[model samples]
Target: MAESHLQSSLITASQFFEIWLHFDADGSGYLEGKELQNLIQELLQARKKAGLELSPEMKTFVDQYGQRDDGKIGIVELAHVLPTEENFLLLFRCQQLKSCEEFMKTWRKYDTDHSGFIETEELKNFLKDLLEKANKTVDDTKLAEYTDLMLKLFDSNNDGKLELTEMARLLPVQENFLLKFQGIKMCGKEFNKAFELYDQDGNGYIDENELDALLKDLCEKNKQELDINNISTYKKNIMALSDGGKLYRTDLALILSAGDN
Candidate 1:
């Protein structure tokens, strides 16, 4: 087989992150629609400018991703399709971690600023620590490359930082209660409205049962994004954000609010 025909042009680690953030902006785990179309056309440089025909090379990429069940290309799948440099792949090789309890411990440990994000330097040290722990020490430049690429990859919103759940992709998300909320997250306005509506007694907070009803409604509405089978686990995890079983707006907002952007 001709490798040349199959190869995507060599992309640097920075380019990989750039591609990922733009495509996976909402972090839905895959390209949901026309963004996939935009991505492939950009890749093949076959703009619709000319008669909308697919050259063999173009056909290769289109069919490659199209073969997927939903025509949805996932992040790692694209990683394989593109010939990204070793560091880009290296960025992914960090071990998936333990439970949500340990995940939060690490989050607070690295967040150092308590500002709710691991910024550039914080991310650098985190990567350095991961490397040092594995006895794979790198020089300053290599470490910086790893750091920059990682922040970009996880900083899907291009926010120049990593949220608690953003970097927690390092954890096996099946146990990552926080990260699982990414897809169904709502804007701050919507969050306030729901919080108000669900705080049925208007006692200014949602109790356990009230929160339960709210999550059930959210789950019903976002059936495609959230697994109904996992609703119990989801409720338990989200309820952990509660204050003595009282689910206040701010606390619930932390998980469900996409924030006031």
Candidate 2:
């Protein structure tokens, strides 16, 4: 008999949270090593403690991590791999950013103060954006409920606000280039200095051509972390936030600045 380990079940929000907390014991917001092993153990307990079927997403998950002794995963990955009631899955549906451009533009809109990180109430508008798109209609209780769940789901570090990459579960982890740059980000103080150097025209923005030189210099210095080989794709994807080829200081900072540092 095949186990239902992969099929996301009809779980209540609290039930989901309970299951997550039990597994994410370190509270790091990701499951790995023995934690993943523990989760696999429980899954098999329910079915045959054996191979089974569900969504192709879960199958792909097992295909990747099934036999590997080392495993790592997070909420968004879990979202894909785990099947839940369509209603419950509705919570994150709005975050499925299809194009990098839309994802960047929407992020710029949500990062209210433009510091590149979202603070407490800014998350409210972000949720509103999601709710409206999902056609959930606005209401107090529903808003409050979604807010709480979103916090638990993605605010992995419990930092009371969201980092760009943290909420960017908008796309799967590996495919997006933002996280690489997020890790490569600079202290807000130094980031401004670097951008100032690149904006030779002093128009408070840099065109794509100007950006290429800047990336070359950056990757030149940080060869260990980045390579010029990926420069064009990275630039175009980031330039998606551009306004007719002009990338604003604050917008560009979204990828490079560490926020209020």
Candidate 3:
């Protein structure tokens, strides 16, 4: 596959940060849809002024995302419009199998009930792992902030944990996985959801059977013509992306490598 057209305009990391700040003008944790849309427009205009054409995919992106002058768009909004797991696949440009292995490791640890689904209690165990590995303590104040943000992501009817559907939509665009995924589970839950969409049985677990089902289902759903057994390479690439989530959209846009202009 070809590299993203955005790659041609790689700018400095500082430039990426500036672009990020534009979306985060208030330094608020959230980026209103209008703010994000304006940033995209700015990039498109800048690229045009530089006599650089966006990649085909980028052009399609502009077509799909440019919206009317008044349409709202943020990272979440963009994800909503492109609600397929493949959208993330494209954004991450998955490269290796280590990512899959690492993801499997995280999945296996919390799938303690063996019921093919995660629960609040089990998720808490994973939270313990994150807390230990986190650079700083997640104190009460931080926890409160984290909790409120996570609750929004859960997006389920339940009061205690992120269910199968909720997990499916937990986009990793936020740079901070620790705080971002922390309270995003369910009311009583601790860990966030996994990226795998669903399994053959439509179950959300990452067990062997579920894994096979998820691979087949995702391929079918996305019109990707690939045998589940033959997707070892693709699986690895996805895993790698998950392992290292990309620069926050804000950071990516500002990065000089991405072309600040």
Candidate 4:
């Protein structure tokens, strides 16, 4: 189940700690009890999925990783016992809907001019950013071909533009007839990449100015009228959830995952 979901990648130390704190409830800076077992089980399954047998069973696994006398695992212990880099990726995997409200933020970024649709050039720009983030490059001709193919597959209106509904349809969808968390979560290098994008000053935190700038840009790109009063309130509320009036990458991760602190 884990191998089916995760890919091999190096998660930087800073990246690991940020995610670690996100799951460390009660502000204890440690993972214990159900949290520890749940995490271990996930990692165990991930390792097994990678075709390796591991254990002295779950309790033993937890005991081995919980280094302190308190029987709670700290970041150092957790990192020491973490599986080969590949398995570390499994902790952040999650299923998401195609065109949720948050997805609109991304879509609106590329759909500049608020045309209510994405033109071929706009899509090329979006694809370009994606490729750059992946550290991959392709020739213009090939890129154009990929875009054309995507439009062919998803542009049902034959208008040569991808509307929000059409773009949502192109995204992978899963059917589950039960209640579930609907927020998005990204981990590892992907999370780092997104954080870097938002931390405009490269200061490791998204300050009020940066958040304001991002929101302003998004509104302008989507051609929505900017409401100064609301923007100020939004920034204040966001900062309230952050540490010392700024959002660290971990805070951003939580917001991305569940839209809460």
Best by lDDT: 2
Worst 10 residues of 3 by lDDT: 251-260
Question: Which residue pairs overlap in candidate 2's backbone?
Answer: 8-83, 8-84, 44-49
User: Clash pairs of candidate 4?
Assistant: none
**Against the hidden reference, what TM-scores do the models get?**
0.52, 0.68, 0.35, 0.27
Q: What are the per-residue Cα lDDT tens digits for candidate 4 across 80-187?
A: 344322222121111123222233334434555333355777766754543443344444433343344334434545556544332332221222100111122233
Task: List model 3 lDDT by residue over 187-260, tens digit each.
Answer: 22111122233322344333333233333433443333333444443243223222133211111111111111
lDDT of 2 by residue, 1-261 (tens): 113323335443334445645666776555665666566455444333333433445444555555434656655555434543344345444445465335655655666534455556876666676666667653544444445555545563575555555454434445455656665566566667777777787766777665665566557756644468766655665565555676765666666555452
For each candidate, the alpha-carbon lDDT, in order, equals: 0.53, 0.55, 0.32, 0.40
Candidate 2, after superposition: displacement of residue 85 in Å?
A: 6.0
User: Local error of candidate 3 at 211, Å?
Assistant: 3.1
Off by over 4 Å in 3: 1-35, 39-108, 114-117, 121-125, 164-210, 224-230, 233-261
Q: Candidate 2, residue 152: CA error in Å?
A: 6.0
How many clashing residue pairs, candidate 3?
24
Best by TM-score: 2
RMSD of each: 8.1, 5.3, 15.5, 16.4
Q: Roughly what TM-score does model 3 have, to 2 decimal places? A: 0.35
Worst 10 residues of 2 by lDDT: 1-10
Q: Give the residue spans of candidate 1 off by over 4 A.
A: 1-11, 18-66, 93-109, 113-115, 132-143, 150-159, 164-180, 189-217, 235-255
